[PDB]
C-alpha cells in the first residue's frame, strides 16, 4: 500500500502537442508500474507495463520511462483519439493507483 501521487490532475491541449504525465511513489517500487487509458463509459486499457514496455497494438507515440519513485508517461503528438483520462498503477505490492490525469480539448 504505497501512496501513488499523479500530476497534473488535468490539462487542456490541442492536436499535435507533446503531453507529459508523471507519477511518483512514496517508496521504491522499482519498475513495476503500468499506464492505463480510460475513455468515458468503458474499461481501462493498458498502454505500458514494467515502466517502459509497450503493450501490443499500441502506437509508438506512447512511451514511458522512470524507475524507483519518479515515473513519466510521454505522448509525442497528441491525436484526436488520445483524449481520455490516464492512470498509473503500482504493481510492486498491494495494487494502488494514481488519482488520474484527464487530457481534454483546448
Amino acid at each position: 500500500d504505497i501512496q501513488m501521487t499523479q500530476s497534473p490532475s488535468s490539462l487542456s491541449a490541442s492536436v499535435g502537442d507533446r503531453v507529459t504525465i508523471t507519477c511518483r511513489a512514496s517508496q521504491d517500487i522499482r519498475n513495476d508500474l503500468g499506464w492505463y487509458q480510460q475513455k468515458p463509459g468503458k474499461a481501462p486499457k493498458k498502454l505500458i507495463y514494467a515502466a517502459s514496455s509497450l503493450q501490443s497494438g499500441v502506437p509508438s507515440r506512447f512511451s514511458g520511462s522512470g524507475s524507483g519513485t519518479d515515473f513519466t508517461l510521454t505522448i509525442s503528438s497528441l491525436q484526436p483519439e488520445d483524449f481520455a483520462t490516464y492512470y498509473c498503477l503500482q504493481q510492486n505490492s498491494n495494487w494502488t493507483f494514481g488519482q488520474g490525469t484527464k487530457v481534454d480539448i483546448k
Binding site: 513495476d32 507495463y49 504493481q91 510492486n92 498491494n94 493507483f97 488520474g100
Partner: protein, 123 residues
C-alpha cells in the same frame, strides 16, 4: 481470444447483500490469479480483492474486510464476489481483471478486464 464478463450488479438497499460473477473464457483460467477493482462515480480506480489460482490465498483492502468474500470455481471458469452489509460508499462499477500467470510476481498482470457491472446501493 481472452474474454471476461461481469454480471449480477444492480440496485440494492443499504444493508442488503449482493453477489457478483465474472465469467472467464479464452485462456487457461485455472492457472491465473484474479482481481476485483471498482470505480466510484466521478472518482478513480481502487483495487478491492485478489484470489490465487488454486483459491489457496485471498487478500482484501481494509475497507471491505469481513464484509466481502472472494471465491472461484475452476470448473465453471467463474470468479465470484460475495458482498454483505452494503454501505452507500460502495456504489461503483466493479471490474474483474486477469492476474498473474504461473511462475511470476503474485502482483503481476492487469492486462485484461471485463466490461463491468455497476452496483448502486440506495433506497
Amino acid at each position: 481470444q481472452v474474454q471476461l464478463v461481469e454480471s449480477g450488479g444492480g440496485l440494492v438497499q443499504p444493508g442488503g447483500s449482493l453477489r457478483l460473477s465474472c465469467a472467464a473464457s479464452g485462456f487457461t483460467f485455472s492457472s491465473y490469479a484474479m482481481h476485483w477493482v471498482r470505480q466510484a462515480p466521478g472518482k478513480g480506480l481502487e483495487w478491492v480483492a485478489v484470489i490465487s489460482s488454486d483459491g489457496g490465498n485471498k487478500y482484501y483492502t481494509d475497507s471491505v474486510k469481513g464484509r466481502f468474500t472472494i471465491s472461484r470455481n475452476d470448473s465453471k471458469n467463474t470468479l465470484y464476489l460475495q458482498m454483505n452489509s452494503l454501505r452507500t460508499e460502495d456504489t461503483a462499477v466493479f471490474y474483474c481483471a486477469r492476474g498473474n500467470p504461473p511462475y511470476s510476481s503474485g502482483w503481476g498482470g492487469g492486462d485484461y478486464w471485463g466490461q463491468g457491472t455497476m452496483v448502486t446501493v440506495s433506497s
